[PDB]
């Protein structure tokens, strides 16, 4: 079901990414510019999964290149993690969006659980390909994709999780989505940034 028949029998990331360009596993390929596959290499020990490409990513062809990605880079650097050593992807690989009159960007819309489950074959192929030691799940959509639709990121901060139906049984660490840290009162943003750095250090210490 979903994307499964579009996923080739290969662990080569370049070939998986090409095949995802042709996926019709849900409706999101229609209005998006292109599939945005994960970035990084199969030697990566840490895999990080966001929700979906946003406006900038949909046109760059790469994940986490916009304001959320810049905040994530600042957190990674503070956690002493090299972004180039990670494998970074998203639960959903085509941008789901709308525009508002007078808006300065295309606005992301939340993928339905249906779309997440349809796209998950790709995440499974990425995980099988990369064999990460730990998966960082950035925000609610990504965390629920592997931990269940009832899972609450806010209730499990700092925790190393392991679930039985995840390929290779990597450690899993669920944390706040970097987009959440972009706005809000300064003290709240600074406390939340420190907690993201903490969670990234937990994952890197696995
Ligand atoms: O790649 C991206 C960029 C922004 N937000 C995400 O969840 N992923
Ligand atoms: S979002 Fe995922 S399942 Fe849906 S068409 Fe795109 S790659 Fe396929």
Numbering used by the authors: 2 to 207
What does the study report here?
UdgX excises uracil from uracil-containing DNA to concurrently form a covalent bond with the resulting AP-DNA. Structurally, UdgX is highly similar to family-4 UDGs (F4-UDGs). However, UdgX is unique in possessing a flexible R-loop (105KRRIH109). Our earlier studies allowed us to propose a reaction mechanism of UdgX, which involves the formation of a covalent bond between H109 of UdgX with the C1′ position of the target deoxyribose sugar concurrently with the uracil excision from this site in DNA.
Furthermore, based on our structural analyses, we suggested that R184 in the DNA intercalation loop (motif B) facilitates localization of the target U in the active site. We combined H109S and R184A mutations and measured the kinetics of uracil excision. H109S/R184A mutant showed nearly 2-fold increase in its Km as compared to H109S, and about 4-fold decrease in Kcat/Km. To understand this further, we determined the structure of H109S/R184A mutant and compared the R184A region of it with the structure of UdgX–DNA complex. Nonetheless, all structures revealed the excised uracil and the side chain substitutions at position 109. The NG and NE of R184 established H-bonds of 3.53 and 3.55 Å lengths with the phosphate backbone of DNA (P + 1), and the NE of R184 makes another hydrogen bond with (P – 1) of DNA backbone with 2.32 Å distance. These observations emphasise the role of R184 in binding of DNA substrate with UdgX. In addition, our biochemical and structural analysis of the R184 mutant shows that R184 is critical in binding to the DNA by establishing multiple interactions with the phosphate backbone in the neighbourhood of the uracil in the DNA. The R184A mutation results in ∼2-fold increase in Km for DNA binding and an overall reduction of ∼4 fold in Kcat/Km value of the mutant confirming its role in stabilization of the enzyme substrate complex.
